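Section 4.2 – Deliverable D4.2 (structural model, holo form)

The reporting period included a commitment to supply a predicted holo structure for the target in complex with protoporphyrin IX containing FE. Inputs used:
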Amino acid sequence: LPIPPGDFGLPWLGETLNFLNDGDFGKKRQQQFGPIFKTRLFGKNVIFISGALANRFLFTKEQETFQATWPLSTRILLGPNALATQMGEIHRSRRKILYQAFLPRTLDSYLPKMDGIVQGYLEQWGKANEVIWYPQLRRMTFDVAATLFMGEKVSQNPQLFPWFETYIQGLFSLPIPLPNTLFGKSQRARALLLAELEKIIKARQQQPPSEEDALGILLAARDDNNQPLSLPELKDQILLLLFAGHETLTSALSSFCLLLGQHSDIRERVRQEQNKLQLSQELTAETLKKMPYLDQVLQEVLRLIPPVGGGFRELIQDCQFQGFHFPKGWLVSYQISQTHADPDLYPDPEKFDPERFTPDGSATHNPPFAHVPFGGGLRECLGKEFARLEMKLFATRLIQQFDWTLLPGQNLELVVTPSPRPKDNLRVKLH
Ligand code: HEM
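Output (structure tokens):
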């Protein structure tokens, strides 16, 4: 019956400029208007919800109620043929296709190359008397990603990271189409990446077909009419995998490096765990599955510092939640970082405690959708198990060979956009 409280502000524009400029935008309007507040963003009316009951609603009867929604600049720079921007039955089809790159045994098989790249970066970081971490994790993740998705020779194309960086920086920028803008820069970085992605694909097309990585899996894939994915699609899809893992996983690793830096007890607890095993050079996918305490740590890392703040959906049906009215063609924004800061769901919600996830912990006795670092439902992270594998293999190889000290004085407060990151971007020494 009734619509949520809150200011629509100006016609079309709404509170768009406040959204774009104001850090505690959602906090100010949650406090005035309570837990469910309306607003207006870029010509759409928008409801902000949060916490377990709102998540269940979003991830419930999902198909007929909610569809993905992106800003104009993002639609354009991602393109019309990416998982993120595809809809209904095409999204249903492409999600099954791409999950082939992420099966538990395709994941296992990624461990060598992945291990070599983490081992590689680990030497280089040791010999430095200081390491500025955030930008260095960025390069390492991109290297794992581009190696596992397209082959080692593709990742030693040195034009790729700089272009990709410039591509990302303008994904959520204003769509102002002059060459000297974040968006015009992204546009040109996109064209450069696409022309490179083509060469890589056409060259792989010319070889004995294999389904050992993501690019081969994509080539062998068939749509619902039994047709190969077209060439623009292959390209968008690979860019999407790159975009979707980049900031997120970099943020996750930074946060772990941060939190076990400032918590040497938990790091020794994680070290103890790996000593009770047979700590040889070799590291199996199976030995990694014998690490329940590190699993807790990574659970906790992701709840305290969630890499994806939240998300948006658009109502395709008039519907209702908590008695409030949620009208067709308005938008809904859910709030991962809010859910993860809620005091009921997490007591002392600002302390780092891996015990919350022990068999009878605080977070074990919580209702569905209380821990949502990967979202949920139809759009839940397609790369969460890949993400979990790299977080874990890294955490292991780090702790195995290194203690580490942050440096005093540095501002390690977090910038929330686009992904949480210490302001001095985490400077460090390895022991
Ligand atoms: C490291 C921690 C990561 C976190 C916390 C994370 C979080 C998320 C979340 C919350 C969503 C849902 C977006 C929404 O609600 O609208 C999402 C989507 C997605 N993620 Fe991740 N992500 C991570 C890493 C990765 C990686 C490494 C990959 C790929 C290798 C990946 C691939 C994807 C894809 C393809 C989607 C879109 C799925 C779809 O539209 O069907 N993520 N991620």
